Design an enzyme around this catalytic site. Structure first.
Site, PDB file in Angstrom:
ATOM      1  N   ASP A 507       0.848  -1.206   0.000  1.00  0.00           N
ATOM      2  CA  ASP A 507       0.000   0.000   0.000  1.00  0.00           C
ATOM      3  C   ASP A 507       0.873   1.242   0.000  1.00  0.00           C
ATOM      4  OD1 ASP A 507      -2.366   1.607   0.326  1.00  0.00           O
ATOM      5  OD2 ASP A 507      -2.306   1.386   2.506  1.00  0.00           O
ATOM      6  N   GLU A 510       2.479   4.914  -4.150  1.00  0.00           N
ATOM      7  CA  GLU A 510       2.452   5.867  -5.249  1.00  0.00           C
ATOM      8  C   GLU A 510       3.780   6.589  -5.574  1.00  0.00           C
ATOM      9  OE1 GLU A 510       0.109   5.621  -2.835  1.00  0.00           O
ATOM     10  OE2 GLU A 510      -1.262   4.479  -4.121  1.00  0.00           O
ATOM     11  N   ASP A 584      -9.394   4.039  -1.760  1.00  0.00           N
ATOM     12  CA  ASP A 584     -10.298   4.496  -0.697  1.00  0.00           C
ATOM     13  C   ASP A 584     -11.614   4.997  -1.281  1.00  0.00           C
ATOM     14  OD1 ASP A 584      -8.277   3.719   1.025  1.00  0.00           O
ATOM     15  OD2 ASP A 584      -7.590   5.733   1.416  1.00  0.00           O
TER      16      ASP A 584
END
Ligand SMILES: OC[C@H]1NC[C@H](O)[C@@H](O)[C@@H]1O
Length: 928
Positions: A507, A510, A584
């Site tokens: 996670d 990015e 999300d």
């Protein structure tokens, strides 16, 4: 969470986006605009499937030029590749500002990260015509494709079947920002330093963007460039009713409470676009890893696209621009959607063979708070007869957000927890992110630093910034040494508390940086190779998932097995590495509806192992919404429930009746179909076939299906799903794509026959709208079990769905679900054909039975049978016949059949019980 009110660059706030939009605005309003780029024809040579020449860009009114090397490759697949570089930069004859050590060259390693095949040049490609103004190359299958390269102004037209389909630079938007020094006069406001989000980009190269107009001639619908909360058929971006005002953006970012129906970037980016019309498909892949924007307009072919006096035929105009790197584009001429996606997958990779368990139901939240919480949830799922495969641990399992640790107050016995799950063949997934806590007494950060494995700043210092652990550094997974170091951390004897059923969630990759601009790194950070972060940003997530994928291949001596890794951030090629999810999302109806076009866009962009958080991440879903969310989520290739830290507990047994029963029924359907789901993943691995398939893909001749994005086919099954995604809806309108017969999966009611139409189907809360198309056979496992592992040796049911042809085909792929023994033939793959009253099973690849020595798994499968066959749409001629004849492995016998005549709109159907044929062997069953 750290950022309360996020700031995202609008297109006007991104310097190079502003410049390219302004370049378009000038060009499209200029009178007799000519692109200031010309091929110097004497520099051109064609050999062995490749054209090479120099483009001269005229840079000022004195006629001064710069040299931009052009390469056009014609590949054996029929794909073409167009690349433009900048010679001064190739030669290193520029000077970076600020004494920067950043690379002078245009970034040219996207290929190394992304491309795995398909690069063989076509020596059959040939120059059919040239003169001093142009040349035409014939290529492709039987020389059916043409590229006409015009020298002055530079343009390329890609043709087949007597027309142009794709044009490059028809509107003259080609823009390669050549290197210049920072000099004052003897609009440059965005050329140099730019500030945004509390950060100033030092911009040591100055302007260097690359952009191009790509026209899809006679196409009204374009698709791809995930990920966006947007329809599958992409919107226009230059205004109009229902359209956007900003280009689609690809700049992988951590976008808190992302909104619906927006061109704003999300977490992953695949710069691959297709155009589809009735019986014609084409596409491009823009191989660039930097920040990329895409503008889209549609209208007539005239310079005023709303003009009178001209043909009505629509062309879609797209305008691509990336911050840095090469102009590097692959062109696909189809002619079908399947062709395009298969060719794309040959280049960038097919879907990895998954861990079988990873098609099961995944149970997650932020957080399960102790090992005892985990063990209690596991027990409760079994008490409520809710099957599941994996339980997930979010970031609170760690010791103060140090990865490769456990909170010893709350997770006292992680091995015991692992072993309890193992008793039902279940798995544990643990989160591991790329930010490594900058603190004392933590060997992981000590090694990251001493081995020089961390991302650096503009001046070569180790980068520091904030995420969950506070002050942190980031693994630079572009560095092969960092990837090799990372492998070592996952060995069972190093990462204590993990074991053979522990897999990994990546996670925040990015990368997410809480105190960075747009919640990410500065653009002038430096990576391995001395590339700027601007050059490689959209690859960053993929490099990290790659590191973790390879860490899971082997975690003890002798082990060699399939990884399972979930990622948030991704690029073209991430399909080779594991699953994604859409980040999300929110617990509301609009996000449930939006999930389906998003998941569909993933698969047609060659990364089908995709899903959204079931229930929505943020907030508390109403019970009816949660229930409908299960009914949709069982059709996501990646099927996980997850919830934000502030959300109430919503493990599915907490919902209450009648929702519990409906949710359990949804779960049981997913599990029963797991043989067909796994087969669908097999096809994704073999040739990039999407796992769930939109109407444009399955029905390229049916124009009405082009934009439809709320229904889809599953795998190779002919199953057509349209989940209910609206509040208080108790019916659904399904578009029936063609003239075949469609049956209700549950009742066998005939929903449509003979003609494409919209059919209205009853759909109360307890109904999953699911149709079976005639002409298909699919396998399922009817016996309910607690997990997929507990189904491994169970018998199969085949459903044979007949239309008026009384003919059908389908397949079933099975293997051990874990190893790479499939590469050496250790698998069963059956092709099932129903024709002329006979069902046959053959090896799908036509292998000879004793061309393969049976391993342990194949031998055990000898006990596993097809036991039940259901024929839906059974011919009346079978009425009153009480047996079928079964033949297999030299033996013949009769098996009982029950024929059920048609009643009202319920189809005739027949059921053969206790068939008793081993799934791995040829068989022939004769009906009637
Ligand atoms: O780890 C906390 C939080 N990070 C962001 C992820 O998108 C979400 O799934 C996760 O729960």
């Amino acid at each position: 969470e750290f950022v309360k009110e996020h700031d995202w660059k609008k297109c006007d706030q991104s310097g190079f986006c502003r410049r390219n939009r302004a370049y378009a605005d000038h060009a499209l309003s200029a009178i007799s605009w000519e692109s200031p780029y010309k091929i110097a024809p004497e520099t051109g040579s064609f050999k062995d499937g490749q054209y090479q020449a120099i483009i001269l860009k005229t840079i000022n009114d004195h006629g001064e030029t710069v040299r931009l090397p052009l390469t056009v490759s014609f590949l054996e697949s029929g794909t073409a590749r167009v690349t433009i570089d900048e010679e001064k930069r190739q030669k290193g004859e520029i000077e970076l500002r600020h004494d920067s050590k950043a690379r002078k060259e245009r970034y040219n390693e996207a290929e190394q990260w992304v491309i795995v095949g398909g690069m063989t040049l076509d020596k059959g490609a040939k120059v059919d015509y040239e003169d001093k103004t142009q040349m035409t190359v014939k290529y492709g299958p039987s020389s059916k494709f043409e590229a006409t390269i015009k020298f002055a102004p530079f343009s390329i037209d890609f043709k087949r079947d007597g027309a142009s389909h794709i044009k490059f630079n028809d509107q003259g938007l080609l823009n390669i920002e050549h290197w210049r020094p920072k000099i004052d006069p003897p609009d440059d406001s965005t050329w140099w330093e730019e500030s945004f989000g509390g950060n100033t980009d030092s911009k040591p190269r100055g302007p260097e963007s690359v952009g191009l107009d790509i026209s899809f001639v006679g196409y009204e619908h374009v698709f791809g460039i995930p990920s966006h909360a947007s329809p599958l058929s992409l919107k226009q971006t230059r205004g109009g009713e229902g359209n956007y005002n900003e280009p689609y953006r690809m700049y992988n970012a951590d976008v808190f409470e992302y909104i619906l129906d927006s061109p704003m970037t999300l977490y992953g980016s695949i710069p691959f676009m297709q155009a589809h019309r009735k019986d014609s498909s084409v596409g491009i892949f823009w191989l660039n890893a930097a920040e990329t924007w895409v503008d889209i307009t549609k209208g007539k072919d005239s310079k005023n696209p709303l003009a009178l006096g001209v043909k009505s035929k629509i062309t879609t105009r797209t305008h691509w621009f990336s911050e840095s790197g090469l102009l590097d584009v692959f062109v696909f001429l189809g002619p079908t959607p399947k062709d395009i996606i298969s060719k794309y997958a040959e280049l960038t990779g097919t879907t990895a063979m998954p861990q079988e368990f990873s098609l099961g139901y995944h149970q997650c939240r932020w957080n399960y708070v102790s090992d005892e919480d985990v063990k209690d949830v596991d027990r409760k799922m079994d008490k409520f007869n809710m099957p599941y495969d994996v339980i997930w641990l979010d970031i609170e399992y760690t010791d103060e957000k140090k990865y490769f640790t456990w909170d010893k107050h709350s997770f006292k016995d992680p091995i015991g927890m692992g072993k309890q799950l193992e008793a039902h063949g279940r798995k544990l997934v643990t989160i591991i992110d790329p930010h490594i806590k900058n603190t004392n007494n933590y060997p992981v950060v000590d090694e990251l630093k001493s081995k020089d494995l961390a991302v650096k700043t503009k001046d070569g210092s180790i980068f520091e910034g904030w995420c969950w652990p506070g002050s942190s550094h980031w693994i630079d997974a572009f560095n092969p040494a960092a990837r090799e170091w990372w492998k070592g951390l996952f060995k069972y004897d190093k990462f204590k508390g993990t074991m053979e059923n522990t897999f990994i969630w990546n996670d925040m990759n990015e990368p997410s940086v809480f105190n960075g601009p747009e919640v990410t790194m500065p653009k002038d950070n430096l990576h391995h190779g001395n590339w700027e972060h601007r050059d490689v940003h959209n690859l960053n997530g993929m490099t990290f998932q790659n590191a973790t994928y390879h860490a899971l291949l082997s975690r003890k001596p002798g082990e060699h097995r399939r990884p399972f890794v979930l990622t948030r951030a991704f690029f073209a090629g991430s399909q080779r590495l594991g699953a994604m999810w859409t980040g999300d999302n929110t617990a509301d109806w609009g996000y449930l509806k939006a999930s389906i076009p998003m998941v569909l866009s993933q698969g047609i962009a060659g990364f089908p192992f995709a899903g959204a958080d079931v229930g929505g991440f943020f907030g508390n879903p109403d019970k009816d919404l949660l229930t409908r969310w299960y009914q949709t989520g069982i059709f996501y290739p990646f099927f996980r429930a997850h919830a934000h830290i502030d959300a109430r507990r919503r493990e599915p047994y907490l919902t209450g009746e009648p929702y519990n029963t409906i949710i359990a029924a949804a779960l049981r359907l997913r599990y029963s179909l797991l043989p067909s789901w796994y087969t669908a993943f097999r096809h994704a691995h073999l040739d990039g076939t999407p796992i769930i398939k939109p109407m444009f893909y399955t029905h390229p001749s049916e124009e009405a299906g082009l934009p439809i994005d709320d229904q889809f086919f599953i795998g190779n099954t002919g199953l057509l799903a349209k989940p209910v995604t609206d509040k208080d809806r108790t019916s659904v309108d399904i578009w029936i794509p063609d003239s075949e017969v469609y049956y209700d999966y549950f009742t066998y009611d005939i929903i449509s026959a003979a003609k494409s139409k919209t059919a209205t189907l009853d759909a109360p809360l307890e109904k999953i709208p699911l149709l079976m198309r005639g002409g298909h056979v699919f396998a399922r496992r009817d016996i309910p079990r607690r997990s997929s592992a507990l189904m491994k040796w169970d018998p199969y049911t085949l459903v044979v769905v007949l239309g008026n042809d009384r003919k059908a085909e389908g397949d079933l792929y099975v293997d051990d679900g874990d190893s790479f023994d499939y590469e050496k033939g250790q698998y069963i793959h059956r092709r099932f054909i129903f024709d002329a009253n006979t069902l046959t099973s053959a090896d799908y690849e036509g292998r000879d039975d004793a061309s393969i020595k049976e391993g342990e798994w194949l031998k055990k499968m000898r006990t596993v049978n097809v036991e039940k066959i259901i024929v839906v749409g059974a011919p009346a001629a079978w009425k009153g016949k009480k047996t079928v004849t079964v033949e297999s492995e030299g033996k013949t016998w009769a098996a009982a059949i029950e024929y059920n005549p048609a009643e009202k709109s319920r189809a005739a159907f027949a059921v053969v019980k206790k068939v008793g044929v081993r799934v791995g062997a040829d068989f022939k069953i004769v009906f009637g």
